[PDB]
Design a protein around this nucleic acid. Structure first.
Ligand SMILES: [Mg+2]
Ligand SMILES: [Zn+2]
Ligand SMILES: [Zn+2]
Lengths: 1330, 49, 73, 50, 149
DNA sequence: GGGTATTCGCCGTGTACCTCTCCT
RNA sequence: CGGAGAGGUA
DNA sequence: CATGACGGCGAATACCC
């Protein structure tokens, strides 16, 4: 019955209109009786009867009497629930200033009246006067007359001026001032200046004035005169120990306000000395501002205990506030919880549910069915029957839950698979039985975990459980598209053991008719499970038509592999099981089954795999014993050799050969080498066993050691843990992070000594505390991401945009971190991907690149692919299916109405707790390409780079670049371009501790504009003795040298100047003042030498990247493109100018600048090194560049830990970060110039203007942090429910904001259907009807 | 606690993810049966009536 | 339909649209007194609706047409 | 009496539970001998020796 | 020393013995570590933890169910559970968690009556906690109201 | 009178569940 | 049946 | 009274012209 939520200020008349009566007495209820005192906080005549349809007096006690107001006691005969809907009012003797509109920064009263907050506070809390109406005297309106000044001013002249004190003065000021006239005055003041800070202040004030003008709110309304009173049933009194009440903590503040108001009013009637009147007025102000926001200004009023009082503002803000505790989440009926145990017999869609729990949960359904067959005439009979737990009631329970799913949830719900739907199977126990394969989805185990169960009530909820949340539909991960039901532990161990082969196992050399004969031989004990045999295998393969063609052949395999083949669905190659099967192999098997055959065979195959793995892990008898931790026989020798080596290098320190620092550095290296040797010996001894062949020969084979099998299969453990078990624990770190010199040479089998164990406790405690404290940061980041992306939903099929992001493989040095296949799988191309021949089109323009398409891409060695991205998608209020691409969880293109923003936020947040906290040598064979390069003559013929810092690519023949290396200024490449490289030889060599001012053309350098002894110094080092020159820094250097800047020109034997061809400005090189001239004057210089010396990660990093935090020392870039120069220096910071209109920027001068005095740079060229601020990247290089930067950095952090997250989620977050635009010029639109508005609004307005033929406004995209972007949303309900509820609500009330129930959070809060998923179409109807 | 004869081996998934398989003889011998004593209070007071 | 809904999903297309159509049909059978178009096998109304959908006997268009006919008498 | 998963031993690296197990067996073994000598009503000298 | 004590008891030094499968009598293929471990029963019994509720008492200020097994309370469907439901697209499940399983008094009463009548259909209304929030914001001297339609 | 660097106050800091005592 | 403090489980 | 938290950010303060 509503479409939007309206918020504004409350006028005194409106507050009176809300109330049903006035509260006058400060005593809540009569303690002698249990009736409430009349006219108090729980008065019945105002708020309603305490009982239903009964007077306070008891005269009327029937529904026939409804509607009759009792004359005796004034109480109306009505439902008692009106007590939680009827509000009161408190008449205030004096105007009181609302605390929210005063102290919530920025002060609204302060901004509106242009007064400082301190001044208003002194006046408000009775420390100063305000000249409301000076008249024609020498006193202005907002002049603060101190009490002395006030009396003396009144003495000299005390009629014309009207200086008042207290909130009544602010009332007078706010009421008198005309908004429109003074707004015009400020608007004309804005253009009548040139000071930027004054412009900022004026526009900040004018925004507040416009907010008041458009909303219809009145300034004087910010000063309260009638105080609303919450309904008493919303602030009840909880009984304790039968006869007494605790502190309500909210009625106390109301009591204090009422008391202070009455005493003020009475000390105003009898009249008193003004000082005590003002004291009473001040303490009434304090009572009201504590009732509204206790503690916001001044000390927090304290109750019976030292605990601060919880005020009205505390009702609605924070974790325990109304929004987060009762609206965004709430306790629900039809719910239970219990300890979870493993059900290994369950199918993937089933859960084990206690029958007692189900009987309690499904109780209304039991009642309904019992009445349905007339076994219980009334509700009471059915309730008694259920309480007795009759057999027929258990039959009813069996019938009800036949196909009615239940939702299982385990906290924390990090991603959506933390809630899944299952078919309940009644079990006799009290614990819930969980299917093993979904445990990884829940991050659940059976060491004490508990889960909650919920019962979908309606048909829509049941079908959403079956079709959306059921475990059979959730086999793939929405974060990366990989399967998430992968077997682990016992199943992996069983499959690995059954698929392992032995050299001389019983039954080797047999030839079997098929898998059934292998199973018969194994079960009858005639053949070992690892016997190498020949088996007739019939496999099936899909053809082009899609039918299964059968091929039968003899396979050289094992008995166990043949047995396992029986459960494999038709259509898979036999080779998929013809190997020892580890966790990786089993996951690949499941993924292949899903890709080829679809969901149903995959679910059946997963169940069969789990059953087979459990059965054969049980049959294997795999155990763990002290003998399995086989310690290498060379361990003691290696330890003694390392000890002798460290003793020798300690003897080196004794005689002074090595310093303490290097002593420790080499002791650490020596111990690391010893640890590596011990680890290698242990693994070599552990990974192999010796076996006698059928020919009596001794043969090596893969070991059947239990722990080695556990590690090799991938079921449990890693090489590192095995090294701790059977090698040595190794080097440990101090709590401060420094490595302890002496490592733990013992292992857990030998046992540590007291000192070693105490040393290891440091790291153990550090890791546990790290986890405990980082979980909170991860949760906070997840909540911020969820908010910033909550409203983003796929709302279109195709917006038709031709833009996109260019995907290439991630290359860092020699290795390629990420194949192009991974980055483009499931993406939609933004252009036709021409075959390298460039003649034809390898894939058409708009193709969802699935497995086969990427197969074609990689097979033809496609270098790069342009794909559509949610960031560049044209759709307003959402994205389109094509730009998002494949739905990773489902495997097809994303459907309309899918809440991709929440999915992206959860996908990024979930692995948050897994996060922490001089030359170039090609390594491979390929041609070398160079871009952004300038080549000139060289002394040795080997090219020197003169271009602004460039890169280098290694392309391996077929045209795919396998390597990239950065090339600084002056790096002289050791080869040419395209020469090809064997691999392992240096390509370029340079000194990272110097940088020249090289001039390509040879000649004699002439020291122009140059003074000896003022701008230069001569030094003669004792070791060398040469008269080298230091170009002293200007601030360091003498006063005389400051006026002249150093300069070095090029002249030749001809006498003229040779300069860079094509230009008009002579080749003149200034030295930056940190340069070392080693050569003498008039020395012929060959190109390719030095002319000067110029010396020179985890979860927090991801949070800083998503918050768009500016780095401490950000890289300076070229704002515009042109030739650089300097200007004023020292006068603050060095000025650099750029011109092709000129640019002028200031730079610390204790920083290093890559560019030289006459070096021309393009827009975005790095002027000074350092981490790049993403704001600058967006400003200069565009949306695409900042998106790529954020994606690359976030994926760097996540790939360091081995976490696989698709880039599209990060792109969704970036798109949410890029929702704001600042107007460069108003144009013909209605947007004011210079303000920040929504980018979609600008798009719509410009599209409409271009339809009308007018000119559209120009805008600059604004990058906002996730917190800032969340708080800057158009919906004030969402922002208030997120953070800073006081500030957001003050903004909304002053502006008079209107909130459309358009996002997910808004509809959740009002309990409507969300505009996503199954409710999406509903909202569409709601849109079309309106 | 109690001294239990224990074998380290997988048993058909019933010891998956730290789960424990317990013989019925352990239940029969009351090895881990425990006594729990709860105190319930019934207070008769004065009410207005 | 009793273990996986992929057949019904492919029949309808959008999964959410499948949920809505199945809910409409299941309400027509639970409260409207309509008879299953498929042989009831002790299934719930939701599962019966899903089974009808995966065989092409029930979709949004068919439901709309039948509703129009029924309201016409 | 109880079947425990071997797979929870390696990654946890709580190897003591293995050694205790071995030692526990040894302990029981000693009792299993003494109990036998108690059921066969052996001489106090033999029990003393063992 | 442990192996010496195992010898004294005529037990294998490896601590591993041949076990047989009770179900079939078949030999487990590898020796199994068999010994005695000293096990403890922790004060985390499933009797004290298992809990379920269909309907029950509700809180005074907000008509949402009570919390805690001792109060026969309902499970809290927090923010992250709501996020999971939104990520699934299960709009109706989320709505019934927010309204008819919660402080929607009229909706929950009608839902119970419909379930007793075999009609699994909800008629959601406005959650009561939203009305509480509206009243609380009114009490701060701020006019917040729903609009026409 | 104007710009910039420093200071100060406010905002935020994981979910779910269980037990006890004490509280105008 | 609200708040506070303490402890604990995942 | 509590005096064991700290990072980020915007408004205000002061310093430097
Ligand atoms: Mg656990
Ligand atoms: Zn009356
Ligand atoms: Zn698009």
């Amino acid at each position: 019955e509503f479409d939007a939520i309206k918020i504004a200020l409350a006028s005194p008349d409106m507050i009176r209109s809300w109330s049903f009566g006035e509260v006058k007495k400060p005593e809540t209820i009569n303690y002698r009786t249990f009736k409430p005192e009349r006219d108090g906080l729980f008065c019945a005549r105002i708020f309603g009867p305490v009982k239903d349809y009964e007077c306070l007096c008891g005269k009327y006690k029937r529904l026939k009497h409804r509607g009759v107001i009792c004359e005796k006691c004034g109480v109306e005969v009505t439902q008692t629930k009106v007590r939680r809907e009827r509000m009161g009012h408190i008449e205030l003797a004096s105007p009181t200033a609302h605390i929210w509109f005063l102290k919530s920064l920025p002060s609204r009263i302060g901004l509106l009246l242009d007064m400082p907050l301190r001044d208003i506070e002194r006046v408000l809390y009775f420390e100063s006067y305000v000249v409301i109406e000076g008249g024609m005297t020498n006193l202005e309106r907002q002049q603060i007359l101190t009490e002395e000044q006030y009396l003396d001013a009144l003495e000299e002249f005390g009629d014309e001026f009207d200086a008042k004190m207290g909130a009544e003065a602010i009332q007078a000021l706010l009421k008198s001032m005309d908004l429109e006239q003074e707004c015009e005055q400020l608007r004309e003041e804005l253009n009548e200046t040139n000071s930027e800070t004054k412009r900022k202040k004026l526009t900040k004030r004018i925004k507040l004035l416009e907010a008041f003008v458009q909303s219809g709110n009145k300034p004087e309304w910010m000063i309260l005169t009638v105080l609303p009173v919450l309904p008493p049933d919303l602030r009840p009194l909880v009984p304790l120990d039968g006869g007494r009440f605790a502190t309500s903590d909210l009625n106390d503040l109301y009591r204090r306000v009422i008391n202070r108001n009455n005493r003020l009013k009475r000390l105003l009637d009898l009249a008193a000395p003004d000082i005590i009147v003002r004291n009473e007025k001040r303490m009434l102000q304090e009572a009201v501002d504590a009732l509204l926001d206790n503690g916001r200004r001044g000390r927090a009023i304290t109750g019976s205990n030292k605990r601060p009082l919880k005020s009205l503002a505390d009702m609605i803000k924070g974790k325990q506030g109304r929004f987060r505790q009762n609206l965004l989440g709430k306790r629900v009926d039809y719910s239970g919880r219990s300890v979870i145990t493993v059900g290994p017999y369950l199918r993937l869609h089933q859960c084990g549910l206690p029958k007692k729990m189900a009987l309690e949960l499904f109780k209304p359904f039991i009642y309904g069915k019992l009445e349905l067959r007339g076994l219980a005439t009334t509700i009471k009979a059915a309730k008694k029957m259920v309480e007795r737990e009759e057999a027929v009631v258990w039959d009813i329970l069996d019938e009800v839950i036949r196909e009615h799913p239940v939702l299982l949830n385990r906290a924390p719900t990090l991603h959506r698979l933390g809630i899944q739907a299952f078919e309940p199977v009644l079990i006799e126990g009290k614990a819930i039985q969980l299917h093993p394969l979904v445990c990884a989805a829940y991050n659940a185990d059976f060491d004490g975990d508990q889960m909650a169960v919920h019962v979908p009530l309606t048909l829509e909820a049941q079908l959403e459980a079956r079709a959306l949340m059921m475990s059979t539909n959730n086999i793939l991960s929405p974060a990366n598209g990989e399967p998430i039901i992968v077997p682990s532990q016992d199943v992996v161990l069983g499959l690995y053991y059954m698929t392992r082969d032995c050299v001389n196992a019983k039954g080797e050399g047999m030839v079997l008719t098929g898998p059934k004969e292998a199973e018969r031989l194994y079960r009858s004990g005639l053949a070992s499970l690892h016997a190498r045999v020949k088996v007739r295998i019939t496999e099936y393969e899909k053809d082009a038509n899609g039918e299964l063609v059968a091929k039968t052949s003899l396979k050289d395999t094992t008995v166990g592999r043949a047995i396992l083949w029986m459960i494999v669905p038709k259509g898979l190659p036999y080779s998929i099981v013809n190997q020892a099967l580890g966790k990786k192999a089993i996951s690949k098997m499941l993924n292949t089954c899903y890709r080829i055959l679809g969901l149903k065979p995959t679910v059946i195959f997963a169940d069969q795999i789990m059953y087979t793995g459990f059965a054969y892990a049980a049959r294997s008898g795999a155990s763990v014993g002290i003998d399995d931790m086989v310690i290498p026989e060379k361990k003691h020798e290696i330890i003694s050799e390392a000890e002798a080596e460290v003793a020798e290098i300690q003897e080196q320190f004794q005689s002074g050969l090595v310093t303490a620092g290097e002593r420790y550095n080499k002791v650490i290296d020596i111990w690391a080498a010893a640890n590596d040797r011990v680890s290698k010996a242990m693994m070599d001894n552990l990974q192999t066993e010796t076996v006698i062949n059928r020919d009596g020969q001794e043969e090596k084979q893969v070991s059947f050691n239990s722990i080695y099998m556990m590690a090799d299969s991938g079921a449990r453990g890693s090489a590192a843990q095995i090294r701790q078990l059977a090698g040595m624990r190794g080097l440990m770190a101090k709590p401060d992070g420094s490595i302890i010199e002496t490592p733990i040479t013992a292992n857990f089998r030998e046992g540590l000594n007291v000192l070693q164990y105490f040393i290891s406790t440091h790291g153990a405690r550090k890791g546990l505390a790290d986890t405990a404290l980082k979980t909170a940061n991860s949760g906070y980041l997840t909540r911020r991401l969820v908010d910033v992306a909550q409203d983003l939903v796929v709302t279109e099929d195709d917006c038709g945009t031709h833009e996109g992001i260019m995907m290439t493989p991630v290359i860092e040095g020699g290795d390629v971190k990420e194949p192009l296949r991974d980055r483009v799988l499931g993406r939609v191309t933004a252009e036709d991907v021409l075959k390298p021949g460039t003649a034809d089109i390898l894939v058409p323009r708009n193709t969802l690149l699935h497995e086969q398409w990427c197969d074609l891409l990689e097979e033809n060695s496609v270098d790069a692919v342009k794909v559509r991205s949610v960031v560049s998608c044209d759709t307003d209020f959402g994205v389109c299916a094509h730009c998002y691409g494949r739905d990773l969880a489902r495997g097809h293109i994303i459907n309309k109405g899918e809440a991709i923003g929440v999915i992206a936020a959860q996908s990024i947040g979930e692995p948050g707790t897994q996060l922490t906290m001089s030359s170039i040598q090609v390594k491979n064979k390929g041609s070398i390409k160079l871009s952004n390069v300038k080549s000139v003559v060289n002394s040795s013929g080997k090219l020197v780079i003169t271009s602004r810092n460039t890169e280098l690519k290694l392309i391996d023949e077929f045209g795919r670049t396998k390597e990239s290396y950065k090339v600084p200024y002056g790096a002289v490449l050791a080869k040419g371009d395209g020469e090809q490289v064997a691999g392992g030889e240096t390509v370029a060599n340079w000194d990272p501790h110097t940088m020249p001012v090289i001039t390509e053309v040879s000649g004699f350098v002439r020291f122009t504009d140059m003074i000896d002894g003022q701008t230069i110094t001569r030094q003669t080092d004792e070791l060398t003795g040469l008269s080298s020159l230091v170009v002293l820094d200007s601030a360091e250097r003498t006063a005389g040298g400051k006026d002249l800047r150093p300069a070095l020109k090029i002249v030749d034997a001809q006498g003229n100047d040779v300069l860079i061809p094509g230009t008009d400005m002579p080749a003149q090189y200034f030295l930056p003042g940190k340069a070392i001239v080693q050569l003498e004057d008039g020395v012929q210089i060959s190109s390719g030498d030095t002319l000067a010396r110029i010396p020179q990660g985890g979860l927090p990093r991801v949070a800083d990247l998503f918050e768009a935090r500016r780095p401490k020392e950000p890289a300076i870039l070229a704002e515009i493109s042109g030739i650089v120069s300097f200007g004023k220096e020292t006068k603050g910071k060095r000025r650099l100018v750029i011109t092709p209109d000129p640019y002028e920027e200031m730079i610390p001068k204790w920083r290093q600048l890559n560019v030289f005095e006459g070096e021309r740079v393009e827009r975005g060229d790095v002027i000074s090194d350092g981490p790049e601020a993403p704001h600058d990247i967006l400003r200069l290089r565009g949306v695409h560049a900042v998106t790529r930067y954020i994606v690359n950095e976030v994926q760097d952090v996540y790939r360091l830990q081995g976490v696989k997250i698709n880039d599209k989620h990060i792109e969704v977050i970036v798109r949410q970060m890029l929702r704001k635009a600042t107007i460069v010029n108003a144009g013909s639109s209605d947007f004011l110039e210079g303000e920040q508005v929504e980018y979609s609004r600008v798009k719509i307005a410009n599209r409409e203007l271009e339809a009308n033929g007018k000119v559209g406004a120009t805008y600059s995209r604004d990058l906002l942090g996730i917190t800032k972007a969340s708080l800057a949303t158009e919906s004030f309900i969402s922002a208030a429910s997120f953070q800073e509820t006081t500030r957001v609500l003050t903004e909304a009330a002053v502006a008079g904001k209107r909130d459309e129930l358009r996002g997910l959070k808004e509809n959740v809060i009002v309990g409507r259907l969300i505009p996503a998923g199954t409710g999406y179409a509903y909202h569409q109807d709601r849109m079309r009807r309106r | 606690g109690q001294n239990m004869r224990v074998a380290f081996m997988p048993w058909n998934g019933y010891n998956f993810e730290d789960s424990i398989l317990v013989s019925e003889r352990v239940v029969q011998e009351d090895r881990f049966t425990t006594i729990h004593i709860q105190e319930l209070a019934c207070v008769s007071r004065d009410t207005k009536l | 339909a009793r273990v996986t809904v992929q057949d019904a999903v492919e029949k309808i297309g959008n999964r959410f649209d499948l949920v809505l159509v199945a809910a409409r049909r299941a309400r027509q059978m639970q409260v409207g007194g309509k008879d299953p178009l498929v042989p009831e096998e002790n299934d719930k109304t939701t599962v019966i609706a899903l089974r009808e959908i995966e065989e092409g006997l029930i979709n949004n268009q068919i439901l709309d047409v039948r509703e129009r006919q029924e309201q016409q008498e | 009496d109880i079947v425990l998963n071997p797979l929870g031993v390696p990654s946890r690296m709580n190897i003591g539970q293995i050694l205790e197990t071995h030692l526990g067996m040894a302990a029981k073994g000693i009792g299993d001998k003494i109990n036998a000598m108690l059921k066969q009503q052996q001489e106090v000298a033999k029990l003393r020796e063992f | 020393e442990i192996k010496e004590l195992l010898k004294l008891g005529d037990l294998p030094t490896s601590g591993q013995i041949r076990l047989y499968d009770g179900r079939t009598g078949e030999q487990f293929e590898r020796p199994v570590t068999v010994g005695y471990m000293y096990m403890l029963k922790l004060n985390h019994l499933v009797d004290d933890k298992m809990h379920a509720r269909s309907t029950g008492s509700y809180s005074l200020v907000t008509q949402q169910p009570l919390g805690g097994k001792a109060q026969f309370g309902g499970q809290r469907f927090g923010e992250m559970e709501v996020w999971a439901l939104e990520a699934y697209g299960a709009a109706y499940t989320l709505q019934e968690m927010l309204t008819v399983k919660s402080d929607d008094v009229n909706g929950r009463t009608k839902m119970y009556k419909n379930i007793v009548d075999g009609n699994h259909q909800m008629e959601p209304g406005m959650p009561e906690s939203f009305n509480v929030l509206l009243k609380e914001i009114r009490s701060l001297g701020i006019n917040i109201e729903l609009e026409d339609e």
